[PDB]
Amino acid sequence: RVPFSLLRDPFRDWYPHSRLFDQFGLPRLPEEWSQWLGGSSWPGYVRAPAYSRALSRQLRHTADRWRVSLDVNHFAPDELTVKTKDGVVEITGKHEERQDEHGYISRCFTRKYTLPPGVDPTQVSSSLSPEGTLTVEAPMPKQSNEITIPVTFESRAQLGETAAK
Amino acid sequence: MTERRVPFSLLRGPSWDPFRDWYPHSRLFDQAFGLPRLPEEWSQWLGGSSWPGYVRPAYSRALSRQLSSGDWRVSLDVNHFAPDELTVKTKDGVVEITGKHEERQDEHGYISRCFTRKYTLPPGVDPTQVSSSLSPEGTLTVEAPMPKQSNEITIPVTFESRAQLG
Amino acid sequence: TERRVPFSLLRGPSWDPFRDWYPHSRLFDQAFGLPRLPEEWSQWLGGSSWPGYVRPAYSRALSRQLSSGRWRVSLDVNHFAPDELTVKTKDGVVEITGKHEERQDEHGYISRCFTRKYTLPPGVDPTQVSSSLSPEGTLTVEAPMPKLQSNEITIPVTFESRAQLGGPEAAKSDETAAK
């Protein structure tokens, strides 16, 4: 799993297709110099600087985003707590009448979204629409062995590599 | 002048083959090779015997990240702990960070260690807006882009009911 | 006449260092090396690979397109998009048959088949007719013209008998030449 369309586009929108990696050192090749990108890549250094920039356009050119919808209007919650644990977005919301002596009708809901592995929680935002529709949206990085994948500090370069699922 | 720089310092002087980034294993690169449709092979390589060393998750966070030094943000030294699993939970405006190690049978053998570090958030934060990050160099760092309100933390009426929310 | 060290032809195409015709393994697993039991399976995918070699419709994916348009005829096949093309030469008639299908979508199970018939110029050997398919989708059928010679075709006596099948004379159907 690699978004290869997004890792190959980032070198291919100019006159040549490898010159973007070539341009931050000059062209002196027997000093270990990437030629091929498919067949020869090397470690991404990629440091008015901006090669690792406008690479994602104004967000190769893609603003991947996980997004989910929740119709809550009928529920009309007094409070919605949304917790992220072990790569699962858990949305707990409570509705109850405030009656001291005897409060009846106390309804709550807890919805567990299975995140696509890779999504860092700092990208996950919740927005409640005027119509009463909860929208949980997150920028996608851009399912490994170690279990703990979420990283990315608003920094999408080299942190992915996961596909749609 | 100030030239003669040629920043070819990122070739990985990690000894075992020209890579060894995070766990010098093959199954590591087997995840970053191509598409997953069974009659599509296994990348079948290992370090030297391969197409070039590509740094294409936490491999760019080996060099530049380190600790990040750090917008809310908190730093946590994890390298010495060296956890097999890290669980980060945000509940009732409290970030709870739980690390775990695990079993290898030897002279030491059956020794477990687990740490729980609790951070009290500023009362603005969407509890889905908090995350951690693990480097190979080993310093966990937790940032949070806080929405705008939520006094008790449990009140998200914004985007439309901004009157009573902010 | 200068500015002659360009680049490109490198197939941007969005997927890996190619997407010449579909991003499949068994596509490139055919042309990698030598066919033994475990003489590897190649194991690239692109971004992770040896070169971006174009070594059979991938060479016709760029330079061909139409074959540009010897007996030679062009056939627009792109809209058809056939999975199989059978070209048959029988009794001096080149018959081009194509078949589609292989997916269950909104249309689904429509089975479409087209039969385009070409009448050969007299003298063309029935073994001498070919077809070629590009990814851009234009089929082109040529045949080397003999000596530009039978009437009914089906008279292959030429390698000894030059008398009745040979040079140019007009008399009472004894021997044709350039038509």
Next chain:
Amino acid sequence: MTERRPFSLLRDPFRDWYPHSRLFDQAFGRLPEEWSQWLGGSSWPGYVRAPAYSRALSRQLSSGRWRVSLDVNHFAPDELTVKTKDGVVEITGKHEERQDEHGYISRCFTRKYTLPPGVDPTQVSSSLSPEGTLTVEAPMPKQSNEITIPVTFESRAQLG
């Protein structure tokens, strides 16, 4: 490419001059943006266009082979019709005694040839010797999944 497989023919076209990678360099063209070093381990798409580099491959033999034999002399056919269908060369000979009333002694033969898949039928020629021996010969292009292999427009480069 003969049932199961030609790299000796793709790795000769670069090796008969002073250096062994330089033949890709001279058919082409700044040399660091994206250039060919190795050809085995690193090759790039073949563009390769006196255009002597595409013409050196054939060694001026084609100017710019599969072969089979058939002893037909005993048969003595009035007509031999050779038909290539679905990547199988089928040779049908017919013999008859022109008789209106009674045309007995009518013999026919049908020989089906396997073919190495890749052989384009435009390359397939039939020749009948004076001694009465049919020879069906074809230039080899230089088996895949798509079923329809035959292409070649008398252009051997990258097909086979």
Next chain:
Amino acid sequence: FAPDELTVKTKDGVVEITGKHEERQDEHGYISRCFTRKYTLPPGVDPTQVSSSLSPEGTLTVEAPMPKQSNEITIPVTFESRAQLGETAAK
């Protein structure tokens, strides 16, 4: 497609629609595509009920009254008399 003729035949409870497009050129009347769509009928649909419709914009609509699978194999009955002839459901 733009067919000169669309011939629709119903055989063994399968509607087979064969369209043909051909040029009218005696020497060489090339450029002639054909298509054969085979519809699996829901068993019980009698072929008197099956109507063919060709729209001005070129969309063929094959419509049929449902009777309201069987062992005997010959299921098509109805005479435009649908009482007690069915029993098959939607599938």
